[model samples]
Target chain A: MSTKAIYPGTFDPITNGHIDIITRAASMFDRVILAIAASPSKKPMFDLEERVALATTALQHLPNVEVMGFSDLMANFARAQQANILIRGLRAVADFEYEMQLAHMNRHLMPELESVFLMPSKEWSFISSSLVKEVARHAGDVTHFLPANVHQALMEKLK
Target chain B: MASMTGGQQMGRGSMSTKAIYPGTFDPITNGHIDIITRAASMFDRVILAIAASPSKKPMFDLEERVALATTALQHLPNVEVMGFSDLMANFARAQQANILIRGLRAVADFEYEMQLAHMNRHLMPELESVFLMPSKEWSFISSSLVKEVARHAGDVTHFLPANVHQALMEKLK
Candidate 1:
């Protein structure tokens, strides 16, 4: 069977960290889906459509990767897409336990789906979408951490 | 076990305070030393309490961790390195300490710290949880990460104290 992976995230404004994982997974899986969650509960800075567009533009060069938005339960989305792998990014000690709990719940939801944990490059490990947004909100230069289109959109959003 | 420093019994509700900085240490890193150093400056006495976390199966034994922390923090007179097996709140109370010092790092982990702070407050109402943000340089260096990188032969010279680094390199060998 082909290895279809679903990398789900808010991708409020896709940071280089997300791109790093996406590129790696793109090479590993036959088909890779970058699933952006609507995440209204988070009050995301970027709308779902905007997030999808930004991720699409940022990752347009990858042939096997596609960007889409979903508001359903993650397990439901994965099953619907017939994806066999679920990807999560881990950066710190605290994130590990939470991810374990999440992976267990996802496993219970879909036994066939495997949870894959990927660590971002050390330089990007400390940056998160929330951190990026908070820093930009305070007028800090986070330009180096995000893709060009994402950075441009973040600056415009804050302005 | 011998206590790292001589006793100071600061009564609760006193103007002068004793702060408890508890962790497994698992070979304390520079990030920990940074927090303890900052904690030492603010409190009358900062107890760098090493936890006997049998559950964690720590890389370094409790005794080794206490020794490493003691050596790394000896320059600060106000800081004391001690090991504890009791609940954190109980240990803090046993020592008559009124403040709990926690290092705030890793954006993804802040919520867990908040939960712990709230729980500590519930268990020991008088013991206040004070969160200290370490310098940005030490933000990404966790003890687990240091050990993981070192296990894979990655250079971790910058993340640990010289004495701890020597011990880790020896242990890995």
Candidate 2:
């Protein structure tokens, strides 16, 4: 039997950092599911469909990876997909602390899903989708931080 | 960590580049060491300038942090560990640093570093700010997180050097 892992994030446009984590997670698990959340409360720049399309296009190269959208609790979604592991990308102190909280809460919500953390490659470590959107909106160069397709979509959205 | 002089150059002329990596390295973790090691390779001289961040209130004193950084980087002859109390730009100018090295570990650090880089450029246009990426092994570990984990009896030896792990254990006690 193969182990399936879920990586749930807002992934407003799936920047290189997200892709880095997704790629690495794909290597570790038999199946790595990129669980994009419809976090309307956070007011994401890209809508659910657009964000999924972007993530699907960006992460298409990984054979073990699959992209899907959901609006339920992460643990619930993980349970639905038969994902036993929940993957989180940890960059720094603050992100780690926040994940610890979520991991504990997810444990209470769904006891079977184990939370795992992955680190990104240095080249993409400092990029985030929100920051990419912010920079593109302010007319800053983000081509270096995002994939070619994502960059093109960002410019079109901002325009 | 420490180089200098950019007057004129002829054929095959090599100029030394001095870079200041200023941080409040209170018990410097592996993350800081990763950046310092990479910077040492590219630059002729690397100054690991420990800062007195009284505002943020670091765990180790300036002297202790410098000693820790100094001991950890002893293998590299090009690295210099020094403590400073001035603004980073002023300290860079005092050391005649042509480059200011900052480590970019995550998305959170990107926005902050961008503003700091632009501000430093405004203050000293000659001193170019260079952002170095830490390896994946060290990227997730921060001094604060290491200390937090150690305080709660977590294994932080994986994220710190031998000298730092020992110092961190003693400090928390």
Candidate 3:
């Protein structure tokens, strides 16, 4: 891990939106680490290793972004890596409100770390990772959400 | 279209399908109207089901909610408004209605609705639930949120139908 990494959510199955953020953040930072947080509150459909593999396959095109998992506070992890910037994606106004609260809390918790939000590409804005998994789980077409490689991997796991 | 064994008619074209749009309808917002209108267009008639639960406290009584929905849907000739305590029982009585109209707002709502649809189907094998997505503009609106905003005397014209707008204003006062 380097000093300019950016952390993201579970990425259980990285959607195009996640890929867009990873690409954008990698360009801004020397190294962008996509830290997968184990959300105890949410029961993820895919385990951590599956999530990491999915993220890795999805971000294969971005040379600067590295994918890994962390089970602790994001700001603490960032501090340990000597990273000062955190990358997040904003899709809608509802997300803005919730993310703003988290950003404010993170700032208060670790004054040195600054959280930045990048709006996902318009086509990818409405495609959420959780919703993607739900649609896939319910037998809906998820070709629009995930990359081709990740989509194939998901199909195998789902089978 | 002949009358079935009971008073119910079979494919009369006038009263073939009578679907219900069941909701708390605290203020009967536009998202609710959108679902109701869409359901009405699909079916021969739609009965706005104003749900009544004794455990939950409502700002407006069942009568008031029913009246608001009735007035709101007055322009639509094929729609009627009624209140019900048990939704499953109401569906059973409305024999012509084979469908239940539901509105989905987000992923969180889908989880609960999926279970409800499964359970309802198990309870009543003949009835099927059809979900309709709300228009993008009214996607974020909900009955609880509507009541919260109305409590502050905020204008809810965009969120609710024209008739409901006046009703909400009166109720908030």
Best by TM-score: 2
Error in Å for residue B45 of model 1 = 0.2
Among all candidates shown, the one with the greatest DockQ? 2
What lDDT does the true structure give each of the candidates? Answer: 0.81, 0.77, 0.71
* lDDT (tens digit, per residue) of candidate 3 on B1-173: 23544532221111245577788888788888877875675456777888777467888799888888888889898888888787653554654566677775675655566567657766764455655556556878888887788789776767877777777677776
Arrange candidates, best DockQ first.
2, 3, 1
Candidate 3: which docking quality band?
incorrect
Please give the distance, in angstroms, between residue A78's alpha carbon in candidate 1 and its true position after superposition.
53
> How high is the TM-score of chain B in model 1?
0.89
Chain A TM-scores, per candidate, are 0.96, 0.95, 0.90
Flag regions of model 1 displaced more than 4 Å: A1-159, B1-14
User: Clashing residue pairs, candidate 2?
Assistant: B1-B46, B1-B79, B1-B80, B1-B81, B2-B45
DockQ list for all candidates: 0.01, 0.02, 0.02
Whichever of 1 and 3 has more lDDT, that candidate is 1
Weakest 10 consecutive residues of candidate 1 chain B by summed lDDT: B6-15
Candidate 1 per-residue C-alpha lDDT over B49-167 given as tens digits, one digit per residue, 9 for 90 to 100:
89887577998998899999999999999998999998889999999998787776656665576567657767986666665555547867899999999999999999998999999
Clashes of 1: 0
